[PDB]
Design a protein around this ligand. Structure first.
Ligand code: UUO
Ligand code: UUO
Ligand code: UUO
Ligand code: UUO
Lengths: 262, 262, 262, 262
């Protein structure tokens, strides 16, 4: 049906995009980047993340496909050599759709609210000075965190920043989010859990300022300075990202290919 | 209905057990340690684990309750001072039952099979020499693990051995198991994922010997030498342990009380 | 001889400072904050670090003493209740001087040089985007580091930021520096050593930009944005900080009191 | 002068050994495996460790050389293709000798003493049940360790078991030993330092039993069950292993070749 193609913007990806558009012109496929049903991302995971956020208002009407022109991007299913096969299989449809969970971040201020959706993770750090927040889980005070910051990851995000922080890798069929620490301070007077925490759907993790109320909050690639923050709330989103699958590429094989050998 | 009480066996726990039996004698409660419906464990988590394995054939007919006579045992909900309140609330029933997931371990041999159920975890180490196994996830070869051993944990087990190995803490409403490494070797020629792995229901993790076929396999407290092993299979059990709850004691508050402060 | 006293600046520390000056007025002690021989720091480790950097040009003519008015500051040897004993013992001198190693950081630019001395550590992060540096040890290319940043610690600094990053704790009689990673990326294409690295005197660790040349460099509490950086060089300083000791307080007991129990 | 050659024992190493003996027969070199001055090890690091322990009584009269017939063994300096060059350079002598520190382990019993020398590390675990020891540093009680065990490493050993336990890598010019934890238990009631600890020469680390007095103690490859143990003492040895060097192969380049790329 309606489709669009985003490109990393180097010569290789731009030309691949033009060739796929040319191939799509031989089928009942309309190029439409306002209301597409298929969104093809040609580049790396950064490119794929930008495509996700470009259309995060129509996630229920869109199936995503990634082509990796560099190395194996984690959200990519195809090499550039298979683009013609992809054009052909996509045009005839009848594919499988799989869905990964997403993370909802709510930022509340004094004398307002903003919500963000993350495919990989949302992190919080301070605006320069020391980072201290109270961690509140389903309204019970769990810990006072002192350190560099905190990272809340989706399942598919667990192989990204979460992994570098010592977090566990979670299969994306698990509707959950995972909280990892960035360089926590632990001594006689300061104490955190240390371990990563995995939360199910409907659990709410709230960060509440102790002194400083300015924070640098990242959502996937995007990092914003937020001022006069009263609370940051994390929960598994009700929204999901949908992928168009045309063949078996299991998550654990994807992990193996990216970290063990390929 | 029918109940029984296990004791750690020190004077404190034995006397508490006798007093609870005396109190139960004032209600329509029959002591029966062959087919109980309530199993009370008075002691620590070691005592509770022994009670679980004492009745792992009737897990669907039993609700467990733990009283901690030492520190806060993780599976314990009551201090000894509340035993009389527990006797009274139990006798009148109408309580809530909550269920935690369990781990199934299957051990196959050459020229046979044995299955085990774990509330905390199942671990594998070698019989002395080097430990090398191929890790196979849903029939795809994921990695060749070299090191001290491997640990597969239930959700409620994530706060136990799993935590000491760097694993994530998982809420027990998540039907999953978590695989953590014990001192993996990683250099130019040997490579493991490093990170803990969290698997959903119906995923099968199989360990297959490379050279030596003798392994020391632990299931909760119980450790056995297994010889001529062809495979060790891990999967989330279809069976669940049921707890009798009489008041709110959230898992994350339980974690806070055990590791942060109480 | 000549002495001065720095205060954290709260009422408790200011009054303690005034009382010690009054007590010192009964001995042959001159208050001189231009060329002191004893520098007393009343506050926490932040206060002590500021005193160190206030006089880092006269480190060979100064013995430092710390009084902790909050909790046990790691560089502190005295509680406020012993200030009168300290005044008396200091006035009569004949004490022991012990010396801890320091870290030298050299920052080179295009179309210039700046050097800094650290008592705790020096860290490097990027100016916002991705952090990528080549790590060069004694002129051999060791690794290309991708991640959040890097931390180079002194021995006495190993209990500070270094500890939160998984670094080892080193006794300060060892003339060394320790390099720890902040959230390194490790996959099929990107590879770091992972482990902390401990370097002896005369080894030089050089960080060289790969793309972006702007970095945020911290030295103890002080963090500066450096632009147009060609190289960051780390080596154990030839300079040392000298402490006035009046009684045994072993480093490992200091570690025990701060992290295990007191 | 006098030399001997140990072989891994496969065909490749045995034949290389015979060829080197044949080449040595053309110089003033005598084969003597009772009082050699050069000890050549042909195999892996396991082979080299056995050669070290074969002659640990004459460490001051011996310079070691390793040839790796498998991958790059860490104590190996030569590939088999350079054996003829090695024979020639060795025969004419005038080489450089470098020395690495060693670890002394003393095991005391009730109603006796045994000492062991380690090139890599010495570890302690329990005889099956729980492992609990009091850690005493220079006669001050530092911590009560509960967990799987403890590992004390030499500098050159830091790239071996120590690395897999999260320990730091230390340059061998530093006369030190490093203590790392194996799966320590840390909760409200049990507390260890967590971090690796690096000790200088003359510091003594003593492990003292709390309940069970039987331990499995490993020294490099060799693991023995020790019964009725009163104390295990660790200190940097006064003895050193000497290597014959014929060219520059820096330790950090050795680390790079083994863990980053070669
Ligand atoms: C940074 C940056 C600039 C690029 C934008 N990227 C895109 C991505 C991605 C992504 N999602 C996943 C995933 N789902 N599974 C597995 N792998 C994944 N990746 C891969 O990780 C790398 C990300 N970029 C870099 O490391 C920058 C290179 C420095 N020369 C690339 O190789 C991706 O192919 C944003 C993502 O960055 C992640 N990120 C940030 N800081 C770190 C860090 N310290 N360690 C590890 N990841 C980190 C974070 O989660 C964010 O969303
Ligand atoms: C060992 C042993 C002998 C005692 C038998 N225990 C009973 C239990 C338990 C248990 N389940 C949980 C849980 N669900 N949540 C949170 N906490 C939990 N615990 C608590 O952990 C301790 C277990 N025992 C010891 O550490 C022995 C003491 C040494 N002086 C106790 O404090 C328990 O109150 C068996 C369990 O041992 C665990 N275990 C074994 N080795 C380690 C290790 N190295 N680190 C951490 N745990 C370890 C493992 O998972 C096993 O099932
Ligand atoms: C930050 C900050 C503001 C305060 C300035 N401080 C002073 C100090 C110190 C210091 N030197 C040592 C030492 N030698 N031994 C053992 N302990 C030590 N400390 C103690 O660590 C804490 C430092 N400050 C904080 O954590 C801020 C509180 C947040 N509400 C205090 O308790 C000190 O009593 C500067 C030092 O910060 C260290 N620092 C920074 N970020 C982290 C982090 N993520 N984790 C751990 N330490 C960190 C770093 O190395 C720097 O030099
Ligand atoms: C085990 C075993 C049987 C072999 C005997 N080896 C010889 C050696 C060595 C050695 N010294 C160093 C060093 N100095 N620098 C860097 N690398 C080094 N190595 C290398 O590490 C490996 C050791 N063997 C194995 O891993 C067995 C293979 C399993 N299929 C080999 O690749 C060596 O080329 C004894 C040494 O084992 C080390 N060891 C034991 N358990 C672990 C573990 N869990 N993780 C990491 N190392 C471990 C320990 O320190 C001991 O001394």
């Amino acid at each position: 049906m309606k489709y669009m193609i985003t490109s990393k913007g180097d010569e290789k990806s731009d030309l691949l995009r033009l060739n796929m558009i040319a191939g799509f012109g031989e089928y009942d496929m309309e190029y439409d980047d306002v209301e597409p049903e298929i969104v093809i991302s040609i580049g790396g995971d950064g490119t794929f993340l930008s495509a996700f956020h470009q259309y995060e208002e129509r996630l229920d009407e869109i199936a995503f496909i990634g082509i990796h022109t560099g190395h194996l991007g984690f959200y990519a299913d195809w090499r550039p050599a298979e683009a013609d096969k992809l054009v052909k299989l996509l045009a005839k449809g009848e594919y499988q759709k799989v869905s990964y969970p997403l993370l909802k971040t709510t930022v509340k201020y004094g004398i307002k609210e903003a919500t963000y959706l993350a495919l990989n993770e949302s992190t919080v750090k301070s605006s320069g000075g020391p980072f201290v927040v109270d961690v509140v889980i389903n309204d019970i005070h769990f810990e006072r965190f002192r350190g560099d910051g905190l990272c809340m990851s989706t399942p598919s995000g667990t192989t990204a920043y979460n992994k570098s922080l010592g977090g566990a890798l979670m299969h994306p069929s698990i509707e959950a989010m995972q909280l990892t620490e960035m360089a926590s301070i632990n001594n006689r007077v300061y104490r955190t859990i240390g371990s990563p925490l995995v939360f199910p759907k409907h659990h709410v993790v709230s960060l509440q300022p102790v002194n400083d109320k300015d924070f640098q909050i990242s959502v996937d690639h995007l990092s914003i300075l937020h001022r006069d923050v009263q609370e940051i709330r994390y929960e598994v989103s009700a929204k999901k990202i949908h992928f168009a699958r045309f063949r078996s590429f299991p998550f654990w094989r994807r992990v193996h290919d990216s970290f063990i050998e390929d």
